[PDB]
Write a protein that binds this ligand. Structure first.
Ligand SMILES: CC(C)CCn1nc(-c2cccs2)c(O)c(C2=Nc3ccc(NS(C)(=O)=O)cc3S(=O)(=O)C2)c1=O
Length: 557
């Protein structure tokens, strides 16, 4: 069937859109080439519509149904609970889009009677009606990149009340079931370092290792009614409250399977028969579906000891090599299977034999050295997009502070330490806004984070090593430095110089500022300080940062 049918009505915005990098007095200090940097808008929504709209066909064999039976058996060991309206309301982002029924996210958060009462009506409706399609808004995402122009991605989401209801029915399922079903293959269970460890450990268990990333062209659009019903049969495997079963069944039929699409103007834009990107089950659905199709495809392609690491639609396999051109033969059969399963590639998958050159989740393992000289593996990425977005955030205040999220996730990296930390802490200093908590997203979930906690956060996630990394890899150094020349970013010599200022200004304030100055910037000096554990690190509750993924899932921790 066709992933989308369109009526001709446009995908429209709520307000005016900037595609051109906003410029303030702080811009040139970071990036000179403003022409590179752009944001996607509703303007290109037609281009995307062209791309995401295709016919799907599926060829399900025994490998598929065999993998499915295993997955279901594991799933049948999960007991999951209903969240109450109260609990579900507290998982709603303060800034989450308001309801069509006369209330917003903050009404839902402090549990106002208008909000709670409607949500009950929605729930009652879900239990009693299992046929009537649920309305969705379709929108074009505004996202910031560097010239490589990508069209805007699309986002499809149900009304606020339905979203609270999703949490009640499924939050606990989508949080706990993926790890039970897929074990070590589930990626959102890992911090950046734990992901690096699982990869390296897994790479090191192959006699002759081969790995590849599989890029599915428009994953959401490949996902069929079958897949979406297949994944519900997995959900229903759990021990569930009877109202959870009904609600999960109703939500699958009325929402997840598909339904009518409506623009911000209230115009009928058509109909979706594929995965919605703005529902609770998106990340978990994509994860289960990708792991199902991919595990089966390795039985097809007859891959030797195939190990997977799945995060939604992002797939990486590591297996035994059958020789360089037998692998090339192996992957084409894999792709053939994946393609039969309704999941063809965007780019053909190339086999790698250098772990440090496998790109999965936009990232790759690299290597550097700690204080002792000891080789330490860490996760890194191409800083192009991070710095393009940091440029936008230099001039605009936005819902998601990508720089803060990037510093957290990529603290051990050259570019994050030298540029991201140096630029943004300087800005917080200048405004004396070091103490203001900032929203940022990790695995799709929203978090309020105070920048002064960064040292404590970084020690816990990465270890004291991250404050001491040096002698980075030559290909890593080359990539950063080349990205810099491309974006017109100052050379790392200037950043080293700026950082000495920032450190000094931070040390002078004392308190947590000195702590930030001490650990985050010890790299800046030649006469270096000896770094010891911080007391506060034990007191932070990070248990929940890397359990599950919730892209488009309206989650706030
Ligand atoms: C271990 C990690 C460092 C690897 C890179 N990384 N980084 C982040 C960051 C959060 C904040 C700054 S970077 C991050 O939020 C993600 C995420 N990756 C994917 C990938 C693939 C998907 N696929 S989907 C849309 O669910 O079908 C979803 C996500 S996410 O949950 O939105 C977050 C990520 O993969």
């Amino acid at each position: 069937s066709m992933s989308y049918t369109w009526t001709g009505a446009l995908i429209t915005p709520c307000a005016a859109e900037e595609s051109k990098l906003p410029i303030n007095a702080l811009s040139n200090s970071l990036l000179r080439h403003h022409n590179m940097v752009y944001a996607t808008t509703s303007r290109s929504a037609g281009l995307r519509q062209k791309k995401v709209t295709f016919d799907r066909l599926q060829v399900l064999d025994d490998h598929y149904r065999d993998v499915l039976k295993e997955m279901k058996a594991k799933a049948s060991t999960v007991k999951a609970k209903l969240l109450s309206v109260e609990e579900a309301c507290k998982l709603t982002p303060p800034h989450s889009a308001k309801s069509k029924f006369g209330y917003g996210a903050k009404d839902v958060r402090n549990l106002s009677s208008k909000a709670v009462n409607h949500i009950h009506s929605v729930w009652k409706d879900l239990l009693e009606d299992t046929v009537t399609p649920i309305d969705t808004t379709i929108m074009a995402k505004n996202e910031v990149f560097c010239v490589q122009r990508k069209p805007a991605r699309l986002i499809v989401f149900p009304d606020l009340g339905v979203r609270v209801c999703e949490k009640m029915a499924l939050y606990d399922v989508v949080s706990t079931l993926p790890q039970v079903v897929m074990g070590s293959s589930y990626g959102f269970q890992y911090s950046p370092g734990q992901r690096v460890e699982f990869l390296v450990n897994t790479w090191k268990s192959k006699k002759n290792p081969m790995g590849f990333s599989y890029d599915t062209r428009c994953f959401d659009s490949t996902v069929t009614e079958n897949d979406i019903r297949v994944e519900e049969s997995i959900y229903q495997c759990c021990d569930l409250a009877p109202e959870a079963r009904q609600a999960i069944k109703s939500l699958t039929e009325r929402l997840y399977i598909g339904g009518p699409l409506t623009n911000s103007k209230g115009q009928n834009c058509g109909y979706r028969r594929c995965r919605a990107s703005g529902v609770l089950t998106t990340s978990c659905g994509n994860t289960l579906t990708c792991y199902l199709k991919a595990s089966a495809a390795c039985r097809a392609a007859k891959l030797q000891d195939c190990t997977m690491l799945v995060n939604g639609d992002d797939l990486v396999v590591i297996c035994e090599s059958a020789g360089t051109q037998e692998d090339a033969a192996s992957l084409r059969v894999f792709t053939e299977a994946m393609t039969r399963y309704s999941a063809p590639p965007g780019d053909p998958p190339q086999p790698e034999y250098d772990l440090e050159l496998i790109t999965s989740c936009s990232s790759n393992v690299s290597v550097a050295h700690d204080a002792s000289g000891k080789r330490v593996y860490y996760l890194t990425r191409d800083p192009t997009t991070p710095l393009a977005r940091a440029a936008w955030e230099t001039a605009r205040h936005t819902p998601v502070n990508s720089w803060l999220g990037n510093i957290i996730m990529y603290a051990p990296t050259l570019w994050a330490r030298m540029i991201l930390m140096t630029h943004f802490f300087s800005i917080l200093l200048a405004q004396e806004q070091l103490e203001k908590a900032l929203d940022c997203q990790i695995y799709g979930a929203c978090y309020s984070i105070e920048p002064l906690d960064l040292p404590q956060i970084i020690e816990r996630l990465h270890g004291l090593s991250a404050f001491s990394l040096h002698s980075y890899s030559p290909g890593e150094i080359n990539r950063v430095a080349s990205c810099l020349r491309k974006l017109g970013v100052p050379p790392l010599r200037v950043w080293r110089h700026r950082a000495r200022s920032v450190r000094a200004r931070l040390l002078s304030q004392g308190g947590r500022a000195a702590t930030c100055g001490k650990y985050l910037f010890n790299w800046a000096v030649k006469t270096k300080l000896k770094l010891t554990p911080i007391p506060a690190a034990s007191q932070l509750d990070l248990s929940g940062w890397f359990v599950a993924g919730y892209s488009g899932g309206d989650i706030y921790h």
